[PDB]
Each structure stands twice: as structure tokens, then as C-alpha cells.
């Protein structure tokens, strides 16, 4: 069985076994939807260690890896002899013929955004930084502005999806697309994704858990990074998705979409505060940076000598010549240094 | 006809005095009027205007009535006071226009940079310039009944530093203000048309009533003062133009001190 929106159907339902990427298993295990199956050493030996590392979370093994998937540039040899090496040359080649991929899912367009340095949940000192969300940096901004510029240049449709892209590529209409190993059974040549601003594309590597093509896939993978396993990924993805729906459709600018994504990523903010920040970013983008700074500030808020006298009538204590003279004056006004009478 | 001339001139002096005194009283009596920094400039202007009606106009009026200059050993100081007051009023108008432009173009920076200290410094600079151009040359015999003939170079320099440059500054200031207002009105009209000229005409009429009055009042006087030394024109027309430039002092508060706030102040004061 393969119900639609499986990643979104499973949470509300919890099938005996689920076959999906490991990035979603984090949120599932955070609430206790997946059963902790006990693995065997003989079963761990027959599998690669990097797969176990990718599927590892909180120091425990959740499910068994099946295979490694990564995006690659699939082009038709009948249309062009060699594939473009840099994104900047696609706008030209395209206009010389007249690239098309899934514009709805953010996983297909994230490589272009992260090519120039876009990142999320930075991996520092061997751990992910949930507070350091760099989806609003210069790299992601350049990637998304280039994406919307290509969309506006009559190069890619704003409503295209995986089905339309596949149907157009099978008929020989489009010259190239971006797809992973799952599209080979339905479909030529495949290669690494083109570079952007000199920097290489960073596609996420989705390891499923419970030859020249493989070479290109592994090269795209090692050029990218493995998807995190923190529960904050799923929601984050949705945020990015909205940005995509806010970028290709032209509903708002790039800065507004990135600010919306940043606000949606913050889980600690309630619904009312989230809507307030969204409206603040809508009605005033001039200070959007300060608004995001205040939103972050609020995110960490809702996160779950002495003298002794022994006279005949006056006795007790009170508080070297510089002090002895003052003590003598005080004693005179009263009618360790000790004085008695 | 001399009697009628006297009547008219006296009426003008009395109206100028009454306007200046009313403006000064309405400004110094209420606190919310002095809260605005720009109003300070107006005060200076008013003060200058007041002097024009006290130490300048009455003496010339009585001299023209009598037909000569009875005030012996007073012509030099009188001409000095006249030049000082004229330069002070012109520079006050110029700085008022500059302040209005700075407030309209960039109000966020105007509210933070323009402070009472800055207004006082500008007023003091204008007064010192007026003094340096009026008293220093006259007392040192550089400008040379009484008629006070004028040299060519000194007259040209005074007309250039006290009328031409401030006039050009005010012209460019009002031009920038008009361009900004026209851009805003065009934006509003485009928005209204997308949602589905009287404002520009009103702005033009306001700018005209503001500038053209002083222009027609003070242009021919300086033109004659610059043409006569080079040579001719008669003294009657020169005196008429001087009286027009002086009546401009009385007309000033009607243009610069007749807004809604000043109207309410005059209504609640009397």
C-alpha cells in the first residue's frame, strides 16, 4: 500500500511497517509512534556504517536502512551532447532550444537554494544548532531570487509538479530535469547538479528506512549532506514549502517568503504570536530583520579596627594613630583597642 | 494728496505693528505654540518685522511728509538699521523655507537633527551676517537733506549676498517641495485609479501666494538699486518700490503666521 501524503497520513493514524526517509522518523519517535526494534550484530555487519549513522538518532537505532537516494541532473542525449556545468548557462541554453523539475516539493529546489551556502540547523561540533537557522542568509536569498527570476523568464511553469515533469520528459519535450534513482525505472544520461555562483549544489541525501548512474548519485550525495533527524525538520520542511509556494506563484517577494519560513520554523511561538509576526512582516518589510530578531528573542523566552570601653557607667564595643585618635575623641564625647575606667 | 499719502503710510505702519505684536503675544503666551522648533524662526522674523515698523518706516514716512531729512546726524544710523532689518527679514524667510523643506522631505531626520539649539544658532548666524553687511560698511564709509548715494561694488555685493542668493535658495527649495508634492499626488491618483487636477492646483496656488508676493515686492527695488549706480530712474519709483518691500513685512505674517494654529491662538486670545 502507498497512500497519498504518507508522511502526513502516518502521524494522525498512529501500517505495520512504514517505508519512508529517516528525516520524518525523528518526529515520529519524539512522540512514540515507532517501535524500538532490537537489531542484531550480524544484521548490522551486512550494512554500511554511514547508513547506520544517517538513521541514528539520540544514540539508538530506529529502523533498518534500505537504500541511499540523492538528486541528480537527468538529461536526454538526443537534445544536447553535454550537460551544463553551471546554473548561469541554463537560462541561455533554454532560450536557445525554444530545465524542468518538481516546483511544488521543496526537496527538488532546495539544492539550488543551498548551493550558495544556504543551510538549516547548522552542524557544529558534531551537533545540530536548532537556534541557528540560516535560511535567511545571503546564499539562500541568492538561490531563491535566481529561482524566481528563472521562473519569471518563461523557463519553468509555476504549477508544474513531478507528474507533469515526468510526462514531459518521457515525451522528449524538456531537455533536462532534476531527479533521483526512483525515476530511472520510469524513464539518456545523468550527472551532478550544476554549480551556482561557482559553488556546488548541496542536495539533501534521503536514506530510506523502515555504473555511471550510481556514480553520479554518489557524487551528488557527497557534494551534499545527509538530512538531519531532529523532530524540527518536518515542520521546517513545510515552512520551506510555503516559501516555494510564495516564490514560484509570485504571491510575495523573496524577503517576505524567507521571513515567513523563518517565523514558521520557530515552534515555541504560539499561533497568535506567529500570526502577529506574519502580519508585521506583511505590512512592514523595511524592519523585517528587527522583527525576526525580536521573534528569536521571544523564542528563547517561551522555551520549555575596633574599640572596647569598660567604664563605670558606659561599657560595650564600638567602631593605627589615625584611628586611635578618632576612637579617643569618640570616647571623650561619650563622657583590638580597649579602654577602661 | 500729501495728506492722503500720510494717512495711507500711517495705516500701513499701524497694521504692521499690530500684526507683529499680535504674533509675538500669541507665540509667547501659549506653551504649545513654542513647542514647535520651526516657530522659533517665525519669532525672529516677527521681531525683525517689528523693527521694520519701529526704526525704519516711521522716519522715512515723516521725512517724505516733510519733504526733507530733519533728523540731523541720523541718516547713517537709519540706513544701517534699514539694511540690517531688510537682510534679517530676507534671511529669516530663507531659513524658514529651508526648514519647511527639510521637514517635508525628511521628517524622521528633521525631528532628530533640528533642535531648538540649532534654530537659535541659525538665527544668530543670520543676525550676525545682517549686522556685518549693514553696520560695518556704513560706519566705515564703505557704502559711499540726506539721500545716501551708493557705490557700485558695495551695492552689487549687498544685492548678491542679501537678495539674489537667498532668492535662488528659496526658488530651488520651493521647486523641490513642489516636485515632491506632485510625485505624492500622482502616486495617490494612480492608486485611486487602480482602485476605481485640484490638489496640484491647490499646491501651486499656495506656493504662488507664498513666493510671488515677496518676489514682486522685493525684485524691482533691488533691480533699480543695481541699475542706478551703473546708469536714469527717478527717486519716486524707487521710494514706491521701497514702500512695497516694506509692506511685504506686514504681509509676511499673513502668509507665514496665519495657519490653523495661529488662527486659533488669535481667536482664543482676543
Amino acid at each position: 500500500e502507498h497512500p497519498d501524503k504518507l508522511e502526513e497520513k502516518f502521524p494522525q493514524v498512529a501500517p505495520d511497517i512504514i517505508f519512508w526517509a529517516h528525516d520524518r522518523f525523528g518526529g515520529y519517535a519524539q512522540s512514540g509512534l515507532l517501535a524500538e526494534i532490537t537489531p542484531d550484530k550480524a544484521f548490522q555487519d551486512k550494512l554500511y556504517p554511514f547508513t547506520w549513522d544517517a538513521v541514528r538518532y539520540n544514540g539508538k537505532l530506529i529502523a533498518y536502512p534500505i537504500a541511499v537516494e540523492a538528486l541528480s541532473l537527468i538529461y536526454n542525449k538526443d537534445l544536447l551532447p553535454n550537460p551544463p556545468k553551471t546554473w548561469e548557462e541554463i537560462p541561455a541554453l533554454d532560450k536557445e532550444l525554444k530545465l524542468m523539475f518538481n516546483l511544488q516539493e521543496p526537496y527538488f529546489t532546495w539544492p539550488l537554494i543551498a548551493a550558495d551556502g544556504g543551510y538549516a540547523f547548522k552542524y557544529e561540533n558534531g551537533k545540530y544548532d536548532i537556534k541557528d537557522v540560516g535560511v535567511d542568509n545571503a546564499g539562500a536569498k541568492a538561490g531563491l531570487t535566481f529561482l524566481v527570476d528563472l521562473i519569471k523568464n518563461k523557463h519553468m511553469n509555476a504549477d508544474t509538479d513531478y507528474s507533469i515533469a515526468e510526462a514531459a520528459f518521457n515525451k522528449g519535450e524538456t531537455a533536462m530535469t532534476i531527479n533521483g534513482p526512483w525515476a530511472w525505472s520510469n524513464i539518456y544520461g545523468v550527472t551532478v547538479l550544476p554549480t551556482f555562483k561557482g559553488q556546488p549544489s548541496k542536495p539533501f541525501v534521503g536514506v530510506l528506512s523502515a555504473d555511471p548512474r550510481i556514480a553520479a548519485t554518489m557524487e551528488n550525495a557527497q557534494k551534499g549532506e545527509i538530512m538531519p533527524n531532529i523532530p524540527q525538520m518536518s515542520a521546517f520542511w513545510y515552512a520551506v514549502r510555503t516559501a516555494v509556494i510564495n516564490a514560484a506563484s509570485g504571491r510575495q517577494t523573496v524577503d517576505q517568503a524567507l521571513a515567513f519560513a523563518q517565523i514558521l520554523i520557530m515552534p515555541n511561538l504560539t499561533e497568535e504570536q506567529r500570526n502577529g509576526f506574519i502580519q508585521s512582516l506583511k505590512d512592514d518589510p523595511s524592519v523585517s530583520k528587527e522583527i525576526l530578531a525580536e521573534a528569536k528573542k521571544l523564542n528563547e523566552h517561551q522555551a520549555p579596627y575596633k574599640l572596647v570601653i569598660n567604664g563605670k557607667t558606659l561599657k560595650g564595643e564600638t567602631t593605627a594613630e589615625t584611628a586611635e585618635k578618632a576612637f579617643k575623641q569618640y570616647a571623650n564625647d561619650n563622657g583590638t583597642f580597649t579602654v577602661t575606667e | 494728496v500729501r495728506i492722503l499719502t500720510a494717512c495711507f503710510l500711517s495705516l500701513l505702519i499701524l497694521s504692521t505693528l499690530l500684526g507683529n505684536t499680535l504674533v509675538c503675544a500669541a507665540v509667547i503666551r501659549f506653551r504649545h505654540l513654542r513647542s514647535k522648533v520651526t516657530n522659533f524662526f517665525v519669532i525672529s522674523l516677527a521681531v525683525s518685522d517689528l523693527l521694520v515698523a519701529v526704526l525704519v518706516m516711521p522716519w522715512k514716512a515723516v521725512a517724505e511728509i516733510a519733504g526733507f531729512w530733519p533728523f540731523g546726524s541720523f541718516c547713517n544710523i537709519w540706513v544701517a538699521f534699514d539694511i540690517m532689518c531688510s537682510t534679517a527679514s530676507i534671511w529669516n524667510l530663507c531659513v524658514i523655507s529651508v526648514d519647511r523643506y527639510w521637514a517635508i522631505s525628511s521628517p524622521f531626520r528633521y525631528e532628530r537633527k533640528m533642535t531648538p539649539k540649532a534654530a537659535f544658532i541659525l538665527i544668530s548666524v543670520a543676525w550676525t551676517l545682517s549686522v556685518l553687511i549693514s553696520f560695518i560698511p556704513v560706519q566705515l564709509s564703505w557704502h559711499k537733506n540726506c539721500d545716501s548715494s551708493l557705490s557700485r561694488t558695495y551695492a552689487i555685493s549687498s544685492s548678491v549676498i542679501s537678495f539674489y542668493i537667498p532668492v535662488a535658495i528659496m526658488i530651488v527649495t520651493y521647486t523641490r517641495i513642489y516636485r515632491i508634492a506632485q510625485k505624492q499626488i500622482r502616486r495617490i491618483a494612480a492608486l485611486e485609479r487602480a482602485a476605481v487636477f485640484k490638489r496640484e492646483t491647490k499646491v501651486l496656488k499656495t506656493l504662488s501666494v507664498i513666493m510671488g508676493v515677496f518676489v514682486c515686492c522685493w525684485l524691482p527695488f533691488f533691480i533699480l538699486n543695481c541699475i542706478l549706480p551703473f546708469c536714469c530712474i527717478d527717486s519716486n519709483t524707487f521710494d514706491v518700490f521701497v514702500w512695497f518691500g516694506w509692506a511685504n513685512s506686514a504681509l509676511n505674517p499673513i502668509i507665514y503666521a496665519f495657519n490653523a494654529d495661529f488662527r486659533k491662538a488669535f481667536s482664543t486670545l482676543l
Partner: nanobody
Amino acid sequence: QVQLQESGGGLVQAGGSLRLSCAASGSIFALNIMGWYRQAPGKQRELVAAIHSGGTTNYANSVKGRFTISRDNAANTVYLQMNSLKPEDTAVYYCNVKDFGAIVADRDYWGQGTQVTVSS
């Protein structure tokens, strides 16, 4: 005459959001500034936010990023969003409309403001 009808103020828990709205009825010149000020009992009236007809906005150093002012396209309706409210934000919020109809001066219109209380 110009009338300013303000609304949206009231009681709100700390950290919540609130949207105040001021409707300006009457003939207003193009060049005009619309701002929100706050006055607390005992203290003096201080500036909170302001916006010019050209789209530029200005905020105080204590409400920068937290508060956001905006104006409508043609309705001349001023909106003020406040997020992450603090206990020291309770005050009477007034709407100041500075009109430059007379180029030689400016006219200030107020709408008596409305009360805003932040709980703790």
C-alpha cells in the same frame, strides 16, 4: 474637520499580540505623517511609531521590531501591530496626524487615544 476613530485597545496577557486600528475621516493632504504615541499615568507622552505618505516608517529604540505601524492605500486607515507585549507597555495610545496642508506650518490632529493594559 478631521475625525480619528481609534479601536482595538483593551486587556491582553503579556507576550500576546494586539492590532489597533485608527480610521481617519475627512479631507487630508497627500503629504502627511500618521503616528502612534503612548502616554502613561504620571509619565510624559513619548513616540512609539510613525509612517510617512511615501512608505517610510520610523520606530523608537524601545519598540523597534516588536511594534509595527502601517497605513492603508486609500482608506487612510492606520494599523498598529504589537507583539511580545511587556508590562511597561500599558498606557493610553494616541494617534497623531501631522498634516502639511500649509507648507509654512503643520497641523496636528488627535483622536483622544485608547487605553491598553498588559497583564502579568
